[PDB]
């Protein structure tokens, strides 16, 4: 509970921003069939030209203002095309002799906007929103989007608009003001209202996870991160339990404990539970890799391109799970019991660190020969998986930034999912589509199992010859789930937005959609 | 028991060591091939060669005492099989007593004098026929010529390769392992080879013991637990033992040995086992073995590709060889000799407490050393371990160490290198190599490289800055720590670990023991 | 033997200096028991101090009172005998002429090694390179046998000689004082032959790959044979093709210089008790081929010395051809070529057929020596010899086994090996015996050809190459000297011509 | 798992049938890839070879 320090200046807690500017945005959705009022603020049109690639602009909605209608005449818009991500600003006076700002953002020529397309449009919007101190934004949808796509619009808008200034001191943006009102004009508007607050919850679950990820390892360590989960569980009134080193030894979690031997922060196992009222029909364990900093251990990350300076993000899976716990805690789904787990620790170089070649014993009695100390995530996860299965659960889904090999197989946009149960994999994929966080099913190639046959222990931690690391690790993990449906999502590639230099909070929406629609 | 420190309560506190192996229960009988081979239960295997033509045909020469088995092994019926080194075939038949038997053969090539490498391959084929077959007896018929020393090598190698080390298996035990209980051997002039049976058994375990120590990983086998291991061994063998801790080591001013350990969580421990024969003592011998329980490299971390940091639990193979020797000597009991078994055990680690590159440290002989590379920690510990060795007043100092990775580029994985300051001692080592059948090869201490150890500030450099022949330069460095005693140094870095079979060789135990029982 | 060119500025021959300033120095060796005379030039005493880095004490009897009073014990106490250290002063002599006297410390050991001798000499040469004199006199106040005295002379000549062929004052008389001086007169002229033999090799090695290519090097061998009346035959590509030397030819396909094989042969007038074939690696430049030397430390800029075994052999031919030993027939062989990168190069994975029918799977084009020597070995054994001794800068591994001082000798014959070892003792060119460990042979078992050119696993490459070369000697005493580590002098930035004196001593003995 | 070997089919040879008795095959397990094969004589004194994988 008390965070150890080396000097009195070391921080003893993760700074968490709970009430964000986004939360103070009154959102209104109106039906487009009645015309849009253009009284104040900035009014942005989302405009497509089906067919003509890079075609012209032509507004379809009726504007209840004679002045603005004149400005939006097709002859005046002829000079603007619909190129995806393009945008324009307009300034005029309305019938009430009041100044107003109007504009559009290009939505291309395809009618079905991809997840990556919607992001390009949202980023263009946020650009107009940034460096602008206007009080209202109005978005007019002149494109067709389903209910899940519209919610994705809001989630992404909220997340990209928010600026994390927790660690700014002398360099806080002084006059960056957030709009206080959001208006949306859309067809069948009544149907989309249901999604507005759901978007708001999903945003913060994602922004929460991003906060924990972005926080550097001195702030976000095993003790301070486990403290943040308890505070979250108390604000949500979830059952919570934090296992310490003493209880971990008694559960014989040798693999997870070994990884932390060299850290100055004691291991901490996070266990939060949400239980619906009434009859429980689905019991689920979600598990997240929680390495608050991955130095690689004696197998130090000193090879060119090993990106040691980024490894504060090796708890992204843990963050996604806690983020999911916020969503589930807020939306209170029915007829489920959800366990949020994560074996938290820090992988460091010390006289107390475990060594390459060591043989440790997992909590299921299996001996493991350590071949590389930077393969620590699957050691912590093996004990987490044995712990989860002991709860007597229907599904175990773990999510982890496990193997850099995902950069070479799927890249930065699609996560990879591995499993031992088709049904469960199917649901994870379905959840990928309604959450709009892309995942691709990759195989667990059993032929590679033999390279994990250790000469002395029960199993090797790493294959010596096979390079398909992401598949090998999934083979290892599967030896620690004996008789339950289990899937594994490798977010090592998609976790960090290198272009934006910030996390994505990837997984929160996907995991929550998996729990809600089961 | 001397307590091993732990980080968590699950950290092992002892090296698991099996002393009663299944090989200790096999009854060995040696028969003279003259007077007939009987074909009892289990498997019967002939070792056959064909001088001259390679892949030549196999002909069974010895006399079998069974008409059916004789008819089955008729030369006309055996021509369909060749003798290519390693080949093997299984036969099945009924004997004079209407009972089913199993016989076979293993090819030994066309060369007359087989080498240890060839014997290794013949034995490997035998073991293959022992595995995945529930046999109660194996019988081997020697239709090939081997001297007494090579015949012992066959038994030991058979025993070593037959043994399967399952100490660290929990849920993955081979529930099908069944060792034979009886082993027959048919050979000409059998009465002369009989005396080698008991020595081979002793030599097997001595080597298998060092093997257990080496394969024990650094969390099981650390400086405290390994010194505890030696204490127990001395205790079972009524050997004298003294274990020097940090306090005495400071009193003894072992600054080089202590520096290497400054960064470990296990305090340094100096092993000193003593065997003194009861008769008039004519030779006094000190054997020194490098005892690094894990060599991360220190601040000169093993991060370069191919550095095999995951293998460095083996940087104590020399200490294991020397302790394995102590078992043999303690068991066989040579009559007119005094033997000291020494090992400066520690662990090379990265910490705020570690010694740094550039550090200047003082050896127990008062010579100051400038540390140029912390990964060359072995020559630092051996330097102090050698000073201590000369202070005992022995006739020969022989150290054995996995010292330089260059060894893989000079002699490879088969032959170890021997360096020294004394031709006669180097000849005894070369002699013991022939009789132990553990290959060693003499390499020079080239004095011209001495100048590159001339530190600008300390008394001596730990490492050469220009010379790339590491294995020689380290020898030059060690030679500065033995002033007036015959001393040889055996680098086993290349030969200690069996990469193909993924296990240690136990190399050096038999070499060193033979040396101890040398004229 | 016309050297092809890219541009008209490309050189068409190796500048080879045959008459060096060394060859114009008259030397006579005097006995120390008759008093030292200091008439001219600079006089240097070689002194050691047994036991104690100690003080210099002059023992010889100098014939000039003026010089005598200067070398008094009290005056020399201020100088020490640390190996190499030295001092010299200028003065007026007995007859009022300017003489110069000094010492060179020979340490404290009585048995001065070759390495110690080299150090003493360099101290001498350093003094000569900073003073215009016409006579040097060396007083031997230390014990050296006949072979070491010669070696002193040779290495003095070599280090004193400076190669200026590529740039856009010597003494004329040398005097030597030693005990039992008559026992040493024999060696003076031998030293000259041994000096130039090695300095000749040094000239060929230092010659860069644009001056020294297969055409210009084989030409230089012919010119050598003609100046020494040796029997020579050079095989061109058409001959090599008819002889089916696929491994030697493979290595050359990428060069703009055609392969040329050198045969230079020597026969003596007496009874022929031993015929010996000398083989030398002659790669005039080793780019590595498609296995380009691009790794750090590859030292591609040095690869003009990959013909050092050839230079050694040709240096041995000069010595033999000059001294004309009796009772021996010696063939001097070298399959010279160049390992380059081109559309016409051989590739890794290429399967080639050696001149003895054996197919070879190429694994790494930078191990070209194995291949050129394989066909050259098949050749040598076809001449019906007693001994085949090849010498090559074959494997970089040597730098990690023996280093830059001692070379490695491998072979299939203990009697031949021992003769090599003995020859190292009398030439004072250090050489150590390494094993041909047969247990590694199996790593050379190609999956598709008869034999692999390289192991993909065994790191003891020098033994693996040996294992590979031995498969091309079917029944002849054969040794193989790997000089990859000893052949170039890095501190001095010049070649050593290593192996000439060693190989010459082999033929005489 | 790794169970013993048991042959089900009936063979047309009294000698081979004897060799394939369940009591004989127990000595061998069915670990994937493991194999053994023995040379023997059939009911007509001709050389055959029976085994398993
Ligand atoms: Zn890692
Ligand atoms: Zn990690
Ligand atoms: Zn080391
Ligand atoms: Zn070491
Ligand atoms: Zn090359
Ligand atoms: Zn080469």
Residue numbers in the entry:
A (entry chain C): 86 to 603
B (entry chain A): 85 to 603
C (entry chain F): 86 to 137, 139 to 254, 262 to 602
D (entry chain D): 138 to 190
Verbatim from the authors:
Although overall sequence conservation is low, M17 aminopeptidases possess a conserved homohexameric structure wherein a dimer of trimers encloses an inner cavity harboring the six active sites. The sequence and structure of the proteolytic sites themselves, as well as the reaction they catalyze, are highly conserved, all utilizing two divalent metal ion cofactors to catalyze the removal of select N-terminal amino acids from short peptide chains. PfA-M17 is essential for the blood stage of the parasite life cycle, and inhibition of PfA-M17 results in parasite death both in vitro and in vivo. The crystal structure of both PfA-M17 and Pv-M17 shows the homohexameric arrangement characteristic of M17 aminopeptidase enzymes, with the six active sites orientated inward and accessible to the central cavity.
We produced more crystals of PfA-M17Inactive and soaked these crystals with a zinc solution prior to data collection. An energy scan of the soaked crystals definitively showed that only zinc was present in the crystals. Merging data from multiple datasets collected at the zinc edge successfully illuminated the anomalous signal. To our surprise, when we solved this crystal structure using molecular replacement, the position of the zinc at site 3 was absent and zinc atoms were evident in sites 1 and 2 as seen in the “active form. The change in the metal coordination site between sites 2 and 3 was accompanied by a significant movement of each L13 loop, returning L13 to its active conformation that permits substrate entry to the active site (RMSD = 0.185 between the aligned L13 loops from chain A of both structures). This novel structure, named PfA-M17Zn2+soak, reveals in situ evidence for the dynamic nature of L13 and the contribution of the metal ions to loop movement. The inactive conformation was metal dependent, as when we soaked the crystals in zinc, we changed the affinity of the metal sites and the protein returned to an active conformation, with both the metals and L13 in a conformation ready for hydrolysis.
